[PDB]
Amino acid sequence: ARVTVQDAVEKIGNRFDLVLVAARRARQMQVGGKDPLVPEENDKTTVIALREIEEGLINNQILDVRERQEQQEQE
Amino acid sequence: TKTEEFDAIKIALASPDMIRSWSFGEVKKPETINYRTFKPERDGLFCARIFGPVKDYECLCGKYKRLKHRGVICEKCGVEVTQTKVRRERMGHIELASPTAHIWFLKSLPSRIGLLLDMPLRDIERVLYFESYVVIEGGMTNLERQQILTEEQYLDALEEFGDEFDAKMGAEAIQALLKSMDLEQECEQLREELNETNSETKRKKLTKRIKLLEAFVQSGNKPEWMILTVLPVLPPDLRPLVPLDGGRFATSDLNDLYRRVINRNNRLKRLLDLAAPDIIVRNEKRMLQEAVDALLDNGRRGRAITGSNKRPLKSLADMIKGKQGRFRQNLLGKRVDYSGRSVITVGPYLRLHQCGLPKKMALELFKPFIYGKLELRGLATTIKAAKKMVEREEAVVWDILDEVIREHPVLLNRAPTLHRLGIQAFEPVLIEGKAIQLHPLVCAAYNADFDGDQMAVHVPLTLEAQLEARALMMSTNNILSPANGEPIIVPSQDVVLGLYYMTRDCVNAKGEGMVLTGPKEAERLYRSGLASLHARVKVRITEYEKDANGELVAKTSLKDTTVGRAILWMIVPKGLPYSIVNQALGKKAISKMLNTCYRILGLKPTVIFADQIMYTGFAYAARSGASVGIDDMVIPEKKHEIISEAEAEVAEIQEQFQSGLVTAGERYNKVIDIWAAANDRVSKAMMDNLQTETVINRDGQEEKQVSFNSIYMMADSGARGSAAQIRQLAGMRGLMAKPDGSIIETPITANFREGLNVLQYFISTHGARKGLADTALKTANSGYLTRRLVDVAQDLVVTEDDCGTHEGIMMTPVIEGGDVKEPLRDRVLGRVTAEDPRNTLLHEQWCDLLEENSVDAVKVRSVVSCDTDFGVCAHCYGRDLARGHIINKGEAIGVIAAQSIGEPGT
Amino acid sequence: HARSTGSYSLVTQQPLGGKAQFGGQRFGEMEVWALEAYGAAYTLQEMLTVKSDDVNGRTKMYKNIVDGNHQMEPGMPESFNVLLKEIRSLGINIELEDE
Amino acid sequence: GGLPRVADLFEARRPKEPAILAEISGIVSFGKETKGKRRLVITPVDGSDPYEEMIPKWRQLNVFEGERVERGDVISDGPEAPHDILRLRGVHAVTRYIVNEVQDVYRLQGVKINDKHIEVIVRQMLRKATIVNAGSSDFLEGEQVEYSRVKIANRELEANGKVGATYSRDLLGITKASLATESFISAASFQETTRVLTEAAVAGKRDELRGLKENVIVGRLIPAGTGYAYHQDRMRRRAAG
DNA sequence: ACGACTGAGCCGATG
RNA sequence: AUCGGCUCA
């Protein structure tokens, strides 16, 4: 996502929750490592959050359900 | 109370013990500094034993140093050893031996004392300024209350009955007056008093008293604190004590006031309990209280003080107002970091999202981006070691820069930001120089032009800042305009002429009767040098239409288009019909392609396609060998006839002037219509004697062909050159006005191909030196108009999921007798409905399907009619026209509204 | 001209034109109009704190772009702390309520 | 005027020579005469029999000696005034008067502004209504129209304080409805700060940080755009408690 | 009776 | 830093 993000906007729905679904995802892959799924084409953690929306992946439904997973692995 | 997650704010009056709390120690002495060495004196306006020391965890005298003694309450120097920043928050006070009439509660009309005591304003001065007495308590001397008496008489009041009768003097009178005027009393004396003698505008003040009393004790204030019993003083850092350059001392007007004030308060104290000659005193309760009605607010009573240069002294008051306080210092006058500035230049190689940032600039911005992504890659051991490799201009520096600018966008700003497109984001790349580069299409979106201009250049930091700069502010969302349903980024100027030159029709150029085997053979037949961009020929085309669902539609056909036209079909992105480019495309009909490209397909290929027009526009613009020759400034053939037959039509009516078939006064205007007849009698022996001028024919012999003239083509393409401009250039200049307006006896005959008469220049002088003096206040008044308008409709947001009632406002097409502009298809567009679907959108694809019924009589649920708490319900509004979709819960409706009046307010 | 870090004027903790560097660019209210129109929530937060004013957080954010964290961590700009201290000494009570 | 034409329209001040819209419908006839005048009579059959009005001295009229006049007629020529039509008809053609003057300025220059943009503000102008009957505080006064529905939709039901409050209409164009922001923060950024920050002291006014101008100053996030869903989670905890 | 553009440049002069 | 001076968008 350098040219135009039109595919990844309407996936989550609007352009404001393309921020706080990608800000949260741009945060998770910057701190404690975290997995690069769709080939890390050089790029940076900026695009990656959005790039996971361009290939049928990251959403708010997948960031508030999988944060319960890192609360079932540390017991 | 500890945690500082603030939620709400409340305001209230200034009690004595309250302001004392904020204060830590009285500002007893009125001293600044010992003009020997710069140390804030003992008990002076500056002092550490009150406000804290002059450094970090240190003192004045010099035993406690560096850090150790965290909050060690010293004495010899006198410092609670804390970090000096206390001098930005801590306060002192000045206890007045005489109560001092506060001003903001008094001379701010209609007086917060006046209609709180049932009184005017002139009065309260008299006793407080010092001439007369006033009565307080109800007893036995027949003087009741709030009575007024000039000195002399009072002798016979405490010499008749006496004992029960109060009446002191001064501001003090107003003090003790507010003490005993019970408020369970005053209140319930006006609810059965508005019973019959009401009247209709005599009761305009009787309702200004019911509000002010009711809202007072129920907040927990009570009115004793109106007049200032004790005076608060600011912290030392804020009022800046700073000795600049030349052993010389820099301080604003704050200090000059705070002092004198105390110089009287000390003359006062030493003359309250040291013999009180009460006439020599009225020199003091006056002059002291006359300087606090100068500190608090200088210019109110009547331009009281001046500086040392006959110009007013600024005050505590004007530290908020005067457009330049701490209110217009949190929004407007707000300096920002991580940015720069430079002059703007073209960039015809760029793709839309691309700016051309000055390498220099990028570097001195991204410093703390590079330092860290250098230490991480393993090229440096500290931040400072990198501070040398950067400045050394080491090569590896620029390496990291390319991968930092990779996936890290920018904000680009032009003042005035009349609306919101005045800022957009553009993904830059590197380009060396001092100069910044940009797109020539967004030229129009910005208030912009390449001639002597400048752009500040911010940088969005947090992951969010970047991505939301990409998600919203970016240029890629802003192809359609906010204010209306037209794209703002259109083929401006030059890009245009290329396409006209290209597409323009013909019958003879270089050979004809050709066919081609697709769009590819065409390009061969040009750049090599085997044909020209003309020649009407039947051409093979593989247009792919869209299926109902999509998209198994691959059509084939063979149609008539010129060499020029068809070349560009290459860049027309597969999914598009052909009849759009089939013609002599002016910017007018070029903007079509976009608008058609946008709604048939989408956003992702309109951007690619359109930017790729721009290149292809300039491509044949230059190649053309186009120019502005004095040949193509052609004059109408018989110009010196049309002026001449109408010049002797002046000499025929003046055979009738002083006599009588027309009178003396009306002369001025009878010929003005026949003058103005020739105005556009010649402009149609010009757009007819230059419109289709060719006549040199290859194919046997015929006449009709569009002109070879360079200028006209601009007026036919829409490059630049209005059908009024052209006249003035090589036709008729015509009618001008006066400073008043009345037109001149002889409008201009000549033009700018031929030479002007001195008179003829000297007249026009006005015409344009009025029309440009307007522009001295054009950018000024629009900005006053805009702001004002934004400030009413800014406290507003989108709110509910739905507002639900069948209601609205009429739309029935405009007919001013016989002249229409916008009827049904492009006015009622987007309006949300309420009858039959009802409660569904009327899209750009819809009032097509509501024109075919012979549609009449409409009512639509809109913004005024919004049964919606505080905001705009969204489902009872319309559409976000800065997009091709329904409006969304978020985009603040208000800001945009007033914004869209500033933009074309220019 | 350019800017990214340096010094600030004592009172309103903001840049000053003169020695060391030129004038740092200004952010107006008609400029903020644009930020108010776009969803520029987080951007407008940095502007007024970690670029100009904030005394404990503008520079304590500095080493979150160096350290490779990329984050806000703001608090309160002093221009308000001035406005508060002016109003208290102008002659008013005004303060912050909590949860 | 010319350019400040635009200004005057949203500003709200009466123009030069207005008309006389027959305020109430019925058997409208004239009576009496002095120099060149005729005292009008408009008595509705229902309860309010009283009603009389008069006119200046060069108006030529289009209702002669008893014709079917309704809620007014296009009587005397000239540019009409703002305030009365809002009082008379309602709020359906009063807005279209705000639109069908301002626009043609741009339609001679050549600009469109899809009309609903004028509404956003006109709603922010038309607001600040004046209520009829004695309900919770005084006859006339200044209170928001939708606050009068925190009143009218509120009073006519629960509790034990039975006095309904049907609304009436005033126009406060920009510099008038602007003044009446009960939020000292945004209030003092564009008016004479004195007149509010002193009436701030008197009554003990607050500002609970709901606004846009408001949130900005304090170094907080805006309740709009991306900051919308943030201020959906913080303002909801003032009721959950 | 009130209300006074949006950016930054350079010089100068006294609280 | 307030004021004064003058240019370019």
Ligand SMILES: [Mg+2]
């Ligand atoms: Mg220009």
Ligand SMILES: [Zn+2]
């Ligand atoms: Zn000491």
Ligand SMILES: [Zn+2]
């Ligand atoms: Zn609605």
